[PDB]
């Protein structure tokens, strides 16, 4: 199809900045091929001469020179192509990663992380072998074949006809064997995955199996899966050996037909001994290249398909709204909800909000309560310009929230997650996350605002220690107080709390809800109980998507 | 591996014969050379026939030997995997054995083939010409030292590059797995910068990797050319001297080339064999680390000085001198401290672990003396954590059954447990397959499925607990009503560890334990209208 041509053109254009390396590689390749083609001719002429010191010396010197030059070029070309491959891989990975960060949250809510890892780890390497490996081997292999056949036709115009007639019986066999192998491999892979799924299922439901004593049935099912896979293994192992036997028988026959015909032609008087030796060497060598050409051309299509699969991810269009530009100097902090209704694109036509309407004020600490199927999370999220409301509008200082700059908005308004997430960086990097620059004096001030210093300050070097992977070494309560300190380091104007008091101290919540970051800054707290009532200036319940 | 000691021996014969059959193309070739300088066709025809026959026989024997070896190795691999999984499941990794066995088998086969080939080639060369063979053996080690040294360095650089790529991959996957927070803090440029900084380190290693590759190629080519020239010179001088003919030299040259190829293959193959052999010992070490006939039970149980503990040590005992007893046809409940771990008593009722002291005989027979096959289908009940397997619903609701129940029986069991409505509402009837590990299940559906799986076997004892905790209030009320409305209170023993006092209200004799033994008990009405634990809990 034309899609393959489009992909090939895109892959050519991706390698545009590698001209100075590709030129040297394609020069050394030609030099090496031309050097390796001509050696047996000089070997045959030496043999004929032996049966005049000047000609002998000239032939020996030329053979040695060609051998050495080819040996050097065959290494220079490989080095250049390896470097080019590495450069292309490192170039494509960065583009693939930097294009994904701009996607909407629905794309990540839908796509499994395994697919992203597969694209960013395996296919970006398979598509990088197209030019340095496939298009290199195919070129030299084909050229070498053309040169060898030209020399063979020059030496004897009759003996070459037999090889020209014999070649299809090799090409067809190689094609058939490759076609069968490429599907046997994937059948084996599917069987192995299905077999592993049984062990995964047994691990998942271990308690019930031990309670009912059903091990003797899970073992039987696993044995059935193994016996299903063994047959495919045996079939592949048999096909290989059959192909090897056929290849060996065919070659011996060709050689004996070549040897007999060549001897009968020499004894007539139309050929010499060195010419027969050179022809035999050429005819022996041609077959390996003929087979490897088919192998490489068959392999190239997998790389093309992997390239298509990778490129299908970085060409997809996002669903973000139009970018904003506004950035006032002093936000008042008044937030109003007007007839807000929302439906998740992943599960559409099942609204969670039905005409929600309320108003927030700087000092009016407003608390939201009521389960509503955990719908309190949704109203918090869409106040940060993470999702767009399908109905109504949400506005900041008499302007829509979507009209403000992305970088500016998330400095005035910040929220704490319901389940805090921490990154594998240091303590200082996690507190100052997202900031261009910070000073350790502010970090101490931010940490002391959440009383987390009682744990941080016992730790060696202070704030420069490495936090465990995704906060592995921190306790549940400790992570809560670290996530809070990540907020007041930014000096927010609007603050949102997702039931932080459920794990953190209630008095700590009151201090966080009454400090300088909350004295005249709008605070919205989400509570699963009536605990927020002790300070809320405007309590608001909402159920079934409708406010109380 | 011993059980296949005969077949492998047969293989170990055939390969040897094949290794002798394929040495007829070089030898006779030299013979043909010695024929072309001394010019009948009879000897030519004889040589041709011998060469063709020997080559064909060698090919056929190799094919047969390979087939036999592969057939045996498949069975060995399958048996090993089955045993490993059985041991792992009963113990309470699998893919490691699967990914190791194929590599080990392939590398061992190649090693054996090429070792035998090399031995045969060396023997025939030594019989041919002693002096040239000695020269080749002397010059082999000196020309096979530097390429290994360069190759090790190149391999180290390659593995370093691959490890760096893997590190960057995670540096990226970790960033991409927490997108809501990154978007909330507007920190995408930071993630891009971190990824770029990670790639800037591999950019340095790639250059030296390429340089090492080029140097390795040059060294290999130079050694390959030098080796052949060194013996060609001495062979030519010997032939010119007149001690040997040209055909012997041609045969020796071909034999030397094949011998060098075999040695190089063996050197390339050996490390993988060593690594796989070393790795299999870990799997080995991980793997290596009768009852009376029951007829019927009336549901009468009792314990005297019963004790049980955790498998880690007998000092983690959660009971000490317990005296639990549930009359047949009477339903009772137990309570106690959260940290007391009384739930293990239910496990003690299921004969999962033998008592640490005393006896727990029930229905006039010892608890661990009955047959395990028939006891597990008459004393089990719904588990503490309801779940649905990946099998079909008609099979999920009857797991662990020796005989598959009929459709009418399954429907009746579901209706008695209230799961008939869930089965009817599910698409495609009972033939629908539930999601693996309860991926698409629901609390009420899971509770109904657990109740159906418990009641399908008509148990003689009930150990249902925490089933209503995961279930809804309506489902809990329905379960309680079904339990209370059973014929003559189900005419069997129930010792449910309820989580709500609503079920314990109708208890025949409630009880509460403390300090590893039952510390209080009596009628529910008496307990709730006195100084008992139930009244204190209700008032508090």
């Amino acid at each position: 199809q034309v899609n393959n041509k489009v992909l090939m053109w895109r892959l050519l254009k991706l390698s545009r900045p590698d001209l100075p390396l590709l030129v040297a590689a394609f020069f050394f390749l030609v030099l090496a091929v031309l050097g390796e083609t001509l050696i047996p001719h000089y070997s045959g002429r030496v043999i004929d001469i032996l049966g005049d010191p000047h000609a002998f010396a000239s032939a020996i010197f030329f053979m040695c020179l060609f051998s050495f030059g080819s040996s050097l070029s065959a290494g220079c070309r490989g080095g250049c192509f390896t470097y080019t491959m590495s450069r292309i891989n490192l170039r494509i990975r960065e583009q693939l990663f930097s294009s994904l960060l701009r996607q909407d949250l629905g794309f990540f809510q839908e796509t499994k992380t395994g697919e992203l890892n597969s694209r960013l780890s395996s296919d970006t390497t398979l598509m990088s072998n197209w030019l340095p490996l496939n298009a290199n081997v195919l070129l030299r292999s084909l050229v070498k074949v053309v040169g060898l056949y030209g020399f063979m036709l020059s030496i004897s115009p009759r003996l070459t006809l037999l090889s020209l007639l014999h070649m299809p019986f090799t090409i067809a066999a190689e094609k058939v064997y490759n076609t069968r192998h490429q599907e046997v491999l994937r059948e084996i892979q599917d069987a192995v995955a299905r077999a592993g799924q049984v062990v995964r299922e047994a691990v998942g439901g271990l308690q019930t199996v031990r309670s009912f004593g059903a091990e003797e049935h899970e073992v039987c099912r696993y044995k059935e899966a193994l016996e299903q896979c063994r047959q495919l293994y045996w079939r592949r192992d048999l096909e290989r050996a059959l192909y090897l036997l056929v290849r060996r028988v065919l070659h011996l026959g060709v050689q004996m037909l070549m040897l007999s015909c060549g001897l009968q032609q020499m004894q007539d008087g139309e050929l010499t001994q060195g010419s027969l030796l050179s022809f035999m060497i050429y005819q022996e060598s041609v077959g390996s290249y003929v087979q490897t050409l088919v192998y490489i051309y068959g392999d190239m299509l997998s790389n093309v398909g992997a390239a298509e699969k990778v490129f299908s991810y970085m060409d997809r269009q996002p669903n973000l709204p139009s970018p904003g530009t506004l950035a006032p100097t002093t936000l008042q902090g008044v937030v109003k909800f007007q007839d807000v209704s929302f439906a998740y694109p992943n599960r559409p036509d099942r609204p969670v909000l039905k005409g929600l309407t309320f108003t927030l004020r700087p000092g009016e600490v407003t608390a939201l309560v009521g389960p509503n199927g955990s719908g309190k999370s949704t109203v918090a999220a869409l106040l940060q310009n993470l999702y767009q409301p399908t109905g109504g509008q949400v506005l900041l200082d008499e302007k829509p929230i979507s009209q403000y700059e992305h970088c500016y908005l998330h400095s005035q308004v910040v929220s704490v997650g319901q389940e805090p997430v921490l990154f594998s960086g240091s303590v200082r990097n996690n507190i100052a996350y997202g900031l261009q620059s910070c000073e350790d004096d502010k970090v101490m001030a931010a940490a002391q605002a959440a009383h987390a210093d009682d744990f941080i300050q016992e730790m060696e070097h202070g704030i420069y220690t490495d936090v465990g992977e995704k906060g592995s070494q921190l306790a549940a309560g400790q992570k809560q107080r670290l996530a809070i300190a990540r907020a007041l380091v930014r000096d927010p104007r609007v603050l949102i709390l997702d039931e932080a008091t459920s794990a953190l101290d209630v008095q700590c919540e009151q201090a966080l809800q009454d400090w300088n970051s909350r004295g005249d800054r709008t605070v919205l707290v989400i509570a699963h109980r009536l605990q927020t009532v002790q300070r809320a200036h405007q309590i608001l319940v909402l159920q079934e998507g409708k406010l109380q | 591996l011993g059980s296949e000691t005969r077949r492998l021996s047969l293989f170990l014969v055939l390969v040897v014969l094949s290794s002798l059959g394929e040495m007829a193309i070089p030898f006779f070739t030299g013979r043909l050379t010695d024929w072309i300088l001394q010019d009948s066709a009879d000897t030519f025809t004889r040589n041709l026939t011998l060469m063709s026959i020997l080559t064909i026989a060698s090919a056929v024997l190799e094919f047969v030997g390979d087939g036999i070896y592969n057939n045996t190795m498949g069975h060995v691999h399958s048996h090993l995997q089955g045993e490993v999984f059985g041991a792992v499941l009963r113990q309470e990794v699998t893919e490691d054995t699967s990914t190791l066995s194929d590599s080990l088998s392939e590398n061992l086969s190649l090693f054996l083939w090429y070792l035998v080939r090399g031995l045969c080639l060396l023997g025939i060369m030594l019989w041919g010409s002693v002096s040239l063979t000695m020269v080749t053996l002397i010059t082999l080690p000196l020309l096979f030292l530097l390429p290994k040294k360069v190759g090790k360095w190149y391999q180290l650089l390659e593995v370093q590059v691959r490890e760096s790529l893997a590190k960057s991959s995670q540096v990226a996957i970790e960033a991409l797995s927490a997108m809501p927070t990154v978007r909330s803090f507007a920190n995408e440029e930071g993630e891009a910068q971190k990824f770029r900084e990670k790639l800037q380190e591999i950019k340095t290693l790639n250059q030296k990797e390429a340089v090492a590759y080029a140097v390795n190629s040059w060294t290999t080519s130079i050694s390959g050319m030098l080796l052949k020239v060194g013996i060609l010179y001495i062979g030519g001088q010997l032939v010119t001297s007149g001690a040997v003919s040209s055909g012997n030299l041609v045969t020796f040259v071909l034999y030397q080339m094949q011998f060098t190829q075999a040695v190089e293959v063996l050197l390339s193959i050996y490390p993988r064999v060593q690594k796989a052999v070393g790795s299999s010992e870990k799997i080995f070490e991980y793997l290596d680390r009768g009852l009376l006939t029951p007829l019927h039970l009336e549901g009468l149980v009792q314990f005297q000085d019963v004790s049980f503990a955790y498998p880690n040590r007998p000092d983690v005992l959660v009971l000490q001198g317990l005296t639990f007893t549930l009359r047949p046809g009477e339903v009772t409940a137990l309570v106690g401290p959260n940290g007391s771990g009384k739930s293990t008593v239910a496990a003690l009722l299921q004969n999962l672990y033998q008592p640490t002291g005393g006896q727990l005989l029930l229905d006039g027979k010892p608890l661990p003396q009955y047959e395990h096959r028939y006891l597990h289908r008459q004393v089990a009940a719904v588990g503490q954590e309801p779940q649905v397997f990946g099998r079909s619903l008609q099979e999920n609701i009857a797991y662990g059954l020796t005989q598959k129940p009929t459709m009418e029986e399954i429907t009746a069991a579901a209706v008695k447990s209230g799961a008939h409505s869930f089965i009817s509402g599910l698409p495609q009837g009972y033939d629908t397959e539930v999601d693996e590990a309860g991926s698409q299940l629901s609390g009420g559906q899971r509770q109904a499925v657990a109740l159906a799986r418990a009641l399908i076997r008509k148990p003689c004892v009930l150990i249902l607990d925490d089933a209503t905790s995961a279930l809804d209030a309506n489902s809990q009320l329905q379960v309680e009503q079904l339990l209370y409305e059973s014929p003559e209170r189900y005419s069997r023993s129930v010792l449910l560890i309820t989580q709500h006092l609503s079920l314990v209200e109708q208890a025949d004799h409630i009880l509460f334990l403390e300090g590893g033994a039952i510390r209080e008990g009596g009628t529910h009405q008496q307990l709730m209208e006195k100084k008992g634990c139930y009244w204190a809990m209700v008032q508090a």
Binding site: L244 | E62, S109, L110, V265
Partner: peptide, 6 residues
């Protein structure tokens, strides 16, 4: 059997 880089 004979070897093959694959």
């Amino acid at each position: 059997r004979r070897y093959s880089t694959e």
